[PDB]
Amino acid sequence: MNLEILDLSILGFYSLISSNSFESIAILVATIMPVITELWYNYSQLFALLYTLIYVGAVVILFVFILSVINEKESGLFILILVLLLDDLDDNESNDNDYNNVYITDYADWFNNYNESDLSVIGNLLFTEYALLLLIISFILLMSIIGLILIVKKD
Amino acid sequence: METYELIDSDPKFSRVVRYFRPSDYLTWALGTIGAPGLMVLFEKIEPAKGNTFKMPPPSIMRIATTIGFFGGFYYAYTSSTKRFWGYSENAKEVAKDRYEVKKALSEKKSPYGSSLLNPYQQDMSARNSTNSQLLLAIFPWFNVANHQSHGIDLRKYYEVRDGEENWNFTLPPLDQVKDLDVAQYKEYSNYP
Amino acid sequence: PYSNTRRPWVLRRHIIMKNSPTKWARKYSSRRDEREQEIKDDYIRGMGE
């Protein structure tokens, strides 16, 4: 009984009935949280946190910052339910039946006596192996800092 | 094609600057004073304000020199680099490189130098800086490390060419030179 | 431990996050599977010879 499915069904409903910009912002948070939680379990815990620190902590509270400076103004129920029920029939984004319905395993090895976190490897590669990517990204962030001022600052 | 001897596929920053021919400094000399001149010449071609010649502000003559200085260095830096790669005349440089490499081997020291980088990082710093000069116009990057992926065979420094027998160099076999791949893995094949 | 390797539920069930040019090809186009089925079929055709 995967309770993750129910939450998305709710979000798949309020997205269709969203009326004002309050609803759309709440869609973003209600999309991030199923992303963050399903990543905290299952695949990668490091990036479940890296989402919260950057997505919610930087952009989403900047979404609601600007939205307060924008505006605040202002089929039925059977069609919305019918749309969801037909949309819910197929939910296999892939079509490799063998790859979906067969489970696998990996065999652990004791060679890596130097156990380290996944972030240490990323730092060990992003700062040495792919330093150019890091230095270009710094350059892009420099462009934005100069870019954001010129657009907004009237003088 | 006008190929020559491949001195160093990845010349070091300190060695590129060292091998600046007197013409190369002149190029740097022109670029450092050419930039203030070009700003003046532009006012000659068309003044910024009005219809009459007006020397640009002294403040601009200072920044333009800085642009020319860091601009004229790269023309010198690129000119020297082409002599290492073999794209430019390097008879003068080959004599200098072979003397220093032979001196390094004779003193039982590595031609490349001691390094603060573990064997992986030397390999990593080779790939980042090698051939970076082909983009030196777009953005700078230099080979400042003492790595060993210079794409040469060190035995080409053993045989004696014309006009070198006078230096009276004695060269030990490669398995006894400090800071080399062949003379580092003597106990564990995983660690230097 | 034997486990599955399917994509996160939010990836394949959000009303918006599941729509992209390459995801529609995965979900509604047989061109990817027809080629990758031949390799699987060749496993059994190449036994007896």
Add this chain to the structure above:
Amino acid sequence: PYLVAFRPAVLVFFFIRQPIGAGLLAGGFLFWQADRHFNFGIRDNIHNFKQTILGFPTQASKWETFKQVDAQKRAQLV
């Protein structure tokens, strides 16, 4: 882990705010969860229908492909 804490609150507010709509989306959710629990074979057959119409390699087609290979190799020995 934040949804596990936030899930009790939102489910309560889904039935209070829109009770008729809640009884369907939650009710419909339980149907498919039950359907996979009890091997009703519905969603599997809704799936197999799509793979047949859109030219995909279906589960039945592979097993038919194996039979064709199996029947051919056996008569090759004879």
Add this chain to the structure above:
Amino acid sequence: RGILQLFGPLGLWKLSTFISSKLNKLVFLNIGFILEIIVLSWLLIVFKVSLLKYILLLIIFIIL
């Protein structure tokens, strides 16, 4: 002055004016308009490429 004018400058002025009238409606600043066509073009990748001639026939039908 007859068929060779219908199959000529006078006839081609009508056809050009008809088509160019349809096109000028499409150029209008709307985010929703440009969004649907981008999503619509994703169907080219999905469809088996044996069905390009039909889409071409349909696209001419919509011009009318």
Add this chain to the structure above:
Amino acid sequence: ASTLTKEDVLTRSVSVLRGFEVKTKDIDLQTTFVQDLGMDSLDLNDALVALEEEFDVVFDDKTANEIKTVGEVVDFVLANYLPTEQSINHTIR
């Protein structure tokens, strides 16, 4: 854009005028206000304000004592009609 024409103002003007005590129900461009309809100060102001509520055009103090006919008001709306600025949501999306 200004979608009002002269006829559109004239056609809808009568209905407002049919909503107030008028001596004659025949009103056109040539019809006056004070004379034909027998309206005094306070009576005429209500009709003039009423046309401001439907045509959404404000009449200034300069024209106040200079209004004598109903054709002038109909022609005035065209020269002074604009659509209210629409927010960023209505305009482009």
Add this chain to the structure above:
Amino acid sequence: EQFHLPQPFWPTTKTKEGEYVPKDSIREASKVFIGSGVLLGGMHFRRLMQYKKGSARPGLAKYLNLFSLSKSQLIGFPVALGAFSFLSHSFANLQEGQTATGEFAASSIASLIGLSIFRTKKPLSSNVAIAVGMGSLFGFLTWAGNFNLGDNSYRAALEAGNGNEGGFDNKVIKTERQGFWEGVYRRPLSQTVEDLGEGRGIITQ
């Protein structure tokens, strides 16, 4: 003896006898009609849902009118696209391969059947000309060889030794007819007699 007319036709992959496994038009046309019926129909309902999301906004109503298919166009197109695919394959089987004539016939009849549904409020002469007009676009497309010549292109022919890369010679006179893109210095007289025909200065006067 026949007439000796020019033959302006691009080369195509000729499927010799025993090849050309026929395609089932009834099933092939079924997929187009059912497939195109769902897309236009489904998008028709989807755009209906957008009108009620917001209607006081002019922009949403403006652009939804561009994509607003009429009621007849919902039947006119799947009929035409369906009939196009049935008529195209059906003429292919008799002709043992698609040609411009087969596609021209299908494209005009498929348009006229389609046009007579959503272009009823127009004279029939106007619809026939449009149906004949749209037939010529597909005939021209098929005469030119779809979107590409494929193997019959000069590059593919050149890479297989059918080009003129090594120059020409006139002592080697090929009895077999040369390729489409191949050039020669000199040609057998019998080939000229087969093409130009005897008469006005060939062989006789």
Add this chain to the structure above:
Amino acid sequence: MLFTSLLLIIVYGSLVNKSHLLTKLINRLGLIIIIYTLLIHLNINTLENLSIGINMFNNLLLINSFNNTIIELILIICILYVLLISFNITGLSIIDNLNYSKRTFIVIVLFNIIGLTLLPLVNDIMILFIIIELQSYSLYLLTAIFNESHNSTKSALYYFIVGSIASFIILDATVSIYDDLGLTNIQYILMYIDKLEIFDLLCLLFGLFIKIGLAPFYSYSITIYSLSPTIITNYISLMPKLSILTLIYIIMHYINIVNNTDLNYVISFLILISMFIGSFGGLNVIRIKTLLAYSSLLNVSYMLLAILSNSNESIIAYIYYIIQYSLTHINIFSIILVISIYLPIMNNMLNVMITKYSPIEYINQLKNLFINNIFIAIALCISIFSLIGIPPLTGFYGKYLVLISGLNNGYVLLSIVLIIASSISTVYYATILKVLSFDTLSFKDIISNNLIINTSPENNNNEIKPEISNVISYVISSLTLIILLIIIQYENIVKGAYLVLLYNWV
């Protein structure tokens, strides 16, 4: 050279006061930075040594003799472009003060030049998705440089939204390729060119097709170009195509390894539609920038026919075409920025509103240019005639070479359509030429002191005062004769195209 001095200008820009004289002189320092970059680049990069292709920066960037040439092309067009803001175009302060108000105009250009040059060189998907953003963002910032304007800002918002969708399409394809193979570097992927899903490279191009404005995505490019100021539209309608058409060619070079027949048909469907829309689109338009926006779509359509064919004649055709269309595009937008000084002045009808951002906006504002400045009109006519294809102008060889590569690969249908769309397009290029001269003799006897140029005071009334600036007039004169007199050096220049190599070798 770019990175070192761009940071110097950024710090120096805000240190000095905001004055149009200091900003203009700072703009000239932008010109000097670009000029040095070209000398430094040409000094170290040669066609002989780059024929193989030389990996750089941990194989993230790979440069060969083909990408090298476009980098030299990008820098040279930018040098001519900066002459539009580093020098006076008209002379009158009212229309030229728009180019001197924004200090960060040149800084943003130098941000885009770094993005423009590195984009053809990307060799990994990780750096592809980054470099496309460094260039893409620089476009959105550039379109919004004039924040007082209402049209320029709405252009950037519309540009930002579509460009973000294109970026997501590009991002999604690279993630899909990564999911199938697990590899990042393009050279590593080439090993598995026979086993990845080839259409995922098509989904990658669909992202790049949006950014250059190819049908059916043409809608936004015409709207954006018709709204941004003429000084801005000259840069955003040409530069993104220089640095993306090259990247498209490199990807198409990889895709033709397998020679997928289904992929050619889909791209040919877009090429066929673009020529239709790019030709019939401009027949009924009144704006000059909207017309040139449709001209840009059609000439992008012609080039993509060469890219799709992708043979040894495509390199010769694409290299020559991209150079000649760039100079011609600079020549026309240089002229339109100068002939704004002959506009009449009222002393009304249709209440036509002309703003200082786009003084020339409608085609009928070119009237009597044969009378006012005949030499300029001939330069404009020559530039227009090149786009038509009148031989022996540079435009004629562009279509002659595209047809050679198009027909050599079997694109018979598209070649015939490309010609028909060349004939249809001639209608709305002749309209420009009709406006200039067709009424010359009926207006030869005219009394008119009501021009914009007549506002300037008479300085001496004896000394000869030229109507136009020295530098901008010389650029128009240099480019006009290149288009007209290319017949002399065409055989040698085409030989220069033979030497350009993209893994041809032998």
Add this chain to the structure above:
Amino acid sequence: MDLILLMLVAVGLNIIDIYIMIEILIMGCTVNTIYSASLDNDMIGLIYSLIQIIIAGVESAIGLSILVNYNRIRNSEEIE
């Protein structure tokens, strides 16, 4: 039921709503990348995901900066 472009109904009817949809779409490509990187036990893919989060962050700022300036333009009269 995606080939009927159903997602367009789910988008709001403001410019700020379009911005949200794009970020959701870009977030879909990162979750797929983290899915691919983890299963392959590859840290090169997780570097890509980190870059996607960072790059998509900048794009959000530039979009809202343009929107804020655009919204200020309508209410830019400043008479008092």
